[PDB]
Amino acid sequence: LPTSCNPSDMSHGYVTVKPRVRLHFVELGSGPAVCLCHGFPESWYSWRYQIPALAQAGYRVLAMDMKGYGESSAPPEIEEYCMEVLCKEMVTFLDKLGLSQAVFIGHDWGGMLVWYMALFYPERVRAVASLNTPFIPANPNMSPLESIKANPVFDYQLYFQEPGVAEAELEQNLSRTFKSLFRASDESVLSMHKVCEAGGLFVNSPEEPSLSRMVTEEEIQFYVQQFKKSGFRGPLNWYRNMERNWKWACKSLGRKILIPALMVTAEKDFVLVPQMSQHMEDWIPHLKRGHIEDCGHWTQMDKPTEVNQILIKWLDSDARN
Ligand SMILES: CCS(=O)(=O)n1ccc2cc(C(=O)NCc3ccc(NS(=O)(=O)C4CC4)cc3C(F)(F)F)ccc21
Numbered sequence: 001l002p003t004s005c006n007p008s009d010m011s012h013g014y015v016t017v018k019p020r021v022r023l024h025f026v027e028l029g030s031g032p033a034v035c036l037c038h039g040f041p042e043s044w045y046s047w048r049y050q051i052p053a054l055a056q057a058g059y060r061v062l063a064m065d066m067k068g069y070g071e072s073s074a075p076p077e078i079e080e081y082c083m084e085v086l087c088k089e090m091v092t093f094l095d096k097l098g099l100s101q102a103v104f105i106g107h108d109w110g111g112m113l114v115w116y117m118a119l120f121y122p123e124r125v126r127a128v129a130s131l132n133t134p135f136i137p138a139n140p141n142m143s144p145l146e147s148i149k150a151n152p153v154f155d156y157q158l159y160f161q162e163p164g165v166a167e168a169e170l171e172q173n174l175s176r177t178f179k180s181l182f183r184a185s186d187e188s189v190l191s192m193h194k195v196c197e198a199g200g201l202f203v204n205s206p207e208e209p210s211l212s213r214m215v216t217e218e219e220i221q222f223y224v225q226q227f228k229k230s231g232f233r234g235p236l237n238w239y240r241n242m243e244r245n246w247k248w249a250c251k252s253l254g255r256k257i258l259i260p261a262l263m264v265t266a267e268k269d270f271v272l273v274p275q276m277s278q279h280m281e282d283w284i285p286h287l288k289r290g291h292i293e294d295c296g297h298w299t300q301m302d303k304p305t306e307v308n309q310i311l312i313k314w315l316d317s318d319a320r321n
Contacts, residue, residue, distance in 0.1 A: 002304050003052040007045065007222070013062070014071070017092040021080075024071035025064045029055025032126065032320055033099050035090075036063040039108020039133075041170070041181070041235045043070055043226050045219075046107070049304035050311065057312045058320075062102070066110060068234025070226045078163070081237035082244040083116050091121055100124070103319045105311065107131035107299060108272070109238045116249070118257045127319040129262035129311060131299045132269050134277040135284065138249035144242040153271050156195040160239045169200045170232045174224040180205050182220070183212040185268035185296035192271065214301050257284045260318040264310055266295040266302075288314060 010026040017023055026044050028051050038046045044063040054061045065072040067086060079085070090113070094102060103126045106114035111133025118128040119135075148154045160166045170177050180189055180202055189205040191198075198204060211217060261284050265274035274291065281287045290310040295303045 002049040002308055005045065005048040005051050012071070015093050015096045017089045017096065020075060021067065021073045021089065023064060023067065023073070023089070023093055025062050026051070027060070027062050028052065029058070029060045031058040031060050032315075033102040034059045034061050034315070034319075035102045035104050036061065037090075037104060037106035037110030037113050038064070038066060038069075039106075039110050040238055041069075041227070041232065042108070043223060045222055045226075046298075046300055048300075050300060050308055053308040054311065054315070057315065059103075059315060062097075064110075066113075068230065068237060070229065074230035074234035076233055078237050078240045079244065081234065082241035082248070083113065084244070084248045086113055087116050087120060090117060091124055094124055101126040103127045103129070103315065105129040105131075106133065108133060108297070115257075118259055118261065119249075119252050119255070122257065122259050125259055127260035127262070127315075128257070129264065129314065131264050131307070132266050132272040132297065134263065134272070135257070135280055136276070137283055138246055138252070140250045144246045148242070153192050156192050156201060157239055159195045159201065160236050163233070163236075163240070166201070166236055167232045169202060170236075171227075174227050175220060176202065176207070176209060177227075178220045178223045179209040179211060179215075182215050182223075182298055182301070183296075184214055184298075184302055185270065187212050188296075214298065258286065260286050260288070262288045262290065262311075262314045262318070264290040264292065264299070264307070266297065266299050267291070267293050268296040269299075271297065286318075288318065290314070 013025045013027050015023050036047045044065050047063045051061050051063055068074045101124055104114035104117050111130035114128050115135040118125045148157055195201055263277050265277055292303050292306050300307055
C-alpha cells in the first residue's frame with residue numbers, strides 16, 4: 001500500500017469564502033497547486049493514499065473537505081449545494097489563497113464539480129482530472145427527471161430527494177453506514193434497485209457488516225467522527241439540485257473545454273459506468289484517458305497504486321510546463 005496520512009500530522013488550512021462558509025483543507029508538498037475534491041459521502045481523507053505520493057512527485061497538494069463535510073461549513077439550505085454556488089466558492093477559495101490557477105482532480109460529486117470548474121472557469125484551472133464521473137453536456141430540451149427515472153441503478157437517488165428521510169437512515173448508526181458503503185464491488189451488500197420500495201438503503205443489509213478488505217476499523221472510525229460534526233444533510237443536498245444544476249449547465253452554450261483533461265474510468269463502478277464517458281472527446285479536444293481494472297466506486301482506496309501512477313504520469317506530462 002502507498003504511504004497514507006495521519007490527520008494529526010497534517011497542515012490544516014481554513015479559508016472563509018463568505019461570512020458563514022469556511023472551507024477546510026489539508027496541505028502537503030511544494031510545486032504546482034493540485035486541489036483534490038472528494039465525493040459523497042467522503043472526506044479529504046479519501047485521498048489519504050494520493051496526498052503523499054503527489055507531494056513526493058513534486059506537487060503542492062490541497063485536499064478539501066467539500067462544503068457540507070468534516071471541518072467545512074455545512075449550512076442546511078439545499079440551494080447552498082448547487083454547482084453554481086459550489087464552483088463560485090472554489091474560485092473565491094483560490095482568490096483568498098492567492099492562487100492564479102490550480103489543477104483540479106475530483107471523484108464522484110467532486111468530479112462533477114471539477115468538470116464545471118473547467119467548463120465555466122478555465123482561466124483558473126490549469127488542468128482537470130475526474131475519477132469515475134463523466135462530463136455529459138446538458139441537453140437544453142430535456143428534463144433531469146426523465147434521465148435518472150430511466151436507469152434503474154439511479155433509484156436510490158430518488159430516495160435521497162426528500163429532506164430528512166435518508167438522513168435518518170444514514171445517521172442511525174454511523175459505523176454501520178460506512179462499513180456498508182465502503183466495500184469492493186464483489187463485497188457489496190446493497191442493491192441500488194427499488195430502494196424506495198424497500199424503504200431504505202440498508203433495510204436488507206447486515207446489522208453488523210463485516211469490514212471490507214479495503215479499509216481498517218480505525219479508518220472507518222475516522223469517517224464516523226467526521227460525520228458526527230454535521231451529519232448527512234449537507235452531503236445529501238448535493239443530490240437535491242438537479243434542475244438548478246441543469247439550468248446553469250445549459251448556459252455553457254456550445255462551448256468546449258479546451259484545457260488539458262483526464263478521464264479515469266473504473267471497470268466495476270456499476271453506477272458511474274465507463275460507457276457513460278463515451279464520446280467525451282467531442283466536447284474536450286485535449287482529453288486523455290486512464291482505465292482501472294478490478295476497481296469499484298471507491299477508486300482511491302480500491303486501487304491506490306494505480307490511481308497514483310495514472311495521475312502522476314498525466315500531471316508530469318500535461319500539468320507541469
Ligand atoms: C452523469 C453524472 S451523474 O450520474 O449525475 N453523477 C455525478 C456524480 C454522481 C454521484 C452519484 C452517487 O450516487 N455517488 C455515490 C455512490 C456511487 C456509487 C455507489 N455504489 S455502486 O453500487 O455503484 C458500486 C460500484 C459498484 C454508491 C454510492 C453511494 F451513494 F452509496 F455513496 C450518482 C450520480 C452521479
